[PDB]
Amino acid sequence: SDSAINVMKWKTVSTIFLVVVLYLIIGATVFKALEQPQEISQRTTIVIQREKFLRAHPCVSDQELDELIQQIVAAINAGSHWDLGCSFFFAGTVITTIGFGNISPRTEGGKIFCIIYALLGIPLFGFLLAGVGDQLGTIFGKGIAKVEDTFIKWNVSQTKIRIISTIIFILFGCVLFVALPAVIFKHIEGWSALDAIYFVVITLTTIGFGDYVAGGSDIEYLDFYKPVVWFWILVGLAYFAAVLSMIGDWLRVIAKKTKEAVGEFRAHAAEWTANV
């Protein structure tokens, strides 16, 4: 019966698909409820500023303002952005799949080489990230070999301590790879604390919106700043990969628990109705 396992697979995939669609719907409702008011409050103010500059300076016509805005929009397509270090940063955003998009190619050959460069570099950087994660995991394994010997002899017994080990992992990881770089970014980039943490998360998840980019403004930066951010990205991508995998394992455990809890509720309602 080869088809039966395919049917089980399709049912599991359909359930996960429905869960993902429902997750997207809930997220859409929440994001709309959070962003619609500010969107309206800024769209009214920009229309106010338009007539504000029409009335504060009668020297500008109504017709020449639209041509000015047209040229400004023509200029936003271009934005040095392709100097020595800018293209290095761009190749980094490409092979890491972060893709901030603040710098993107406009030449046809630029796009062709970007396609080839991504297709070849994403796996290579994957190898590098796997190696870095292995090294970091062996370091943290020496650390847990030190921690699970001083507390493994007295009060708490096992099976429950694997959770404590994961807790120590998450805590020190949020300290080293999130909190400290967030403070450094808050002080150097001029971002807020929430903005810094938001940038850290959007970058280390490889989402990379591009609204916040470390080194992106035209601020003077110390010679060690951007390379240290490179190193932080290297190690933090490994850390966040580990964290996302752990969250996935937790979701797996929760899914099994919820399947058997649905079984429990059904098995109770059944023999409860049968008591006539």
Ligand X SMILES: CCCCCCCCCCCCCCCC
Residue 215: CB minimum distance to ligand Q6F, A: 3
Q: Is 99 in the site for K ion (CB under 5 A)?
A: yes
Our CB check for ligand CCCCCCCCCC shows the closer of 129 and 161 to be: 129
Candidates 91, 92, 97, 198; binder of K ion (CB under 5 A) is 97
Q: Is 226 in the site for ligand Q6F (CB under 6 A)?
A: yes
Q: Is 209 annotated as a binding residue?
A: yes
Residue 11: CB minimum distance to ligand CCCCCCCCCC, A: 4
* CA 58 – CA 61 distance, rounded (Å): 7
Pick what 146 binds: its own copies, ligand X, K ion, none; C-beta below 5 to 8 Å, kind-dependent. none
Site string for K ion, 190-229 (x = CB under 5 A): ----------------x-x-x-------------------
Short-list 206, 192, 276, 273, CA closest to 237:
206
User: Which residue bears the tokens 């590098």?
Assistant: 128
Q: Is 151 annotated as a binding residue?
A: no
Q: Is 27 annotated as a binding residue?
A: no
Q: Is 236 annotated as a binding residue?
A: no
Short-list 215, 174, 220, CA closest to 197:
174
Long-range Cβ pairs for the range 181-190 (8 Å, 24+): 181/229, 181/232, 181/236, 185/214, 188/219, 188/221, 188/225, 189/214, 189/215, 189/217, 189/219, 190/217, 190/219
Pick what 99 binds: K ion, ligand X, ligand Q6F, none; C-beta below 5 to 8 Å, kind-dependent. K ion
Q: Is 215 annotated as a binding residue?
A: no
- Binding positions are 97-100, 206-209
The contact set with ligand CCCCCCCCCC (CB under 6 A) reads 11, 14-15, 18
